[PDB]
Amino acid sequence: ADRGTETVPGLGQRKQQILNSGGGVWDLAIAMLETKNLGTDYVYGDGKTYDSANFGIFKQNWFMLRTSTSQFKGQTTNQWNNGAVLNSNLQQDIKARQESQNYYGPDKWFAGHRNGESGLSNPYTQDITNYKDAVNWIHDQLASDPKYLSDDTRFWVDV
């Protein structure tokens, strides 16, 4: 198969932190696919620079953060290192992402999250649609039983 489960020790305490710091099950599912341990200790920017750089547990790219969040509204591609603050502020991480989705709408947020500025022109490419449904599958799992909100079960889908 191309999706399943895996045990990650401590994951349950990270899930509760996200749900107690302004997150909902929807944010948990997005963050669950981005990283294995719901954290921010991947390589800085996820290896990318300028508008492509990724920050926070959801790996929001800088283009999205500076066009659609109040924390970064109006900043330029050159200030892209400023997004790094989300790596250590979970509440702002979660809040930036919720604000971003509500500025663009769920489907264009998806397109922007996955492809950056160039996705905004067609939110329904197969690539972006494969991101949506994966996240939607994971949400269904976490919402099928509340034990999954505090155990170490990671529901994963292959990209």
Ligand X SMILES: OC[C@H]1O[C@@H](O[C@H]2[C@H](O)[C@H](O)[C@H](O[C@H]3[C@H](O)[C@H](O)[C@H](O[C@H]4[C@H](O)[C@H](O)[C@H](O[C@H]5[C@H](O)[C@H](O)[C@H](O)O[C@@H]5CO)O[C@@H]4CO)O[C@@H]3CO)O[C@@H]2CO)[C@@H](O)[C@@H](O)[C@@H]1O
| Binding interface with ligand X (CB under 6 A) | 6, 33-36, 46, 48, 51-52, 54, 59, 61, 63, 113-116, 156-159
CB nearer to ligand X: give 35 or 95: 35
Q: Rounded to 5 degrees, what angle do the CA atoms 63, 58, 10 make?
A: 160
Q: How far is the CB of 129 from ligand X (least distance, A)?
A: 13
> Residues 57, 113: contact at Cβ < 8 Å?
no
Q: How far is the CB of 24 from ligand X (least distance, A)?
A: 19
Q: How far is the CB of 7 from ligand X (least distance, A)?
A: 11
CB nearer to ligand X: give 19 or 132: 132
Q: How far is the CB of 14 from ligand X (least distance, A)?
A: 14
Q: How far is the CB of 6 from ligand X (least distance, A)?
A: 6
CB nearer to ligand X: give 20 or 37: 37
CB nearer to ligand X: give 3 or 73: 3
Helix, strand, coil share of the chain (percent; to 5):
60, 10, 30
CB nearer to ligand X: give 4 or 146: 4
Q: Any residues with CB less than 8 A from the CB of 62 and at least 6 apart, and which? A: 50, 51, 52, 53, 55, 77, 80, 83
Distance CA 148, CA 141 (A): 8
DSSP string, 26-55: HHHHHHHHH-SSSSS-SSGGGG--GGG-EE
Q: What residue number has its CB nearest to ligand X?
A: 116
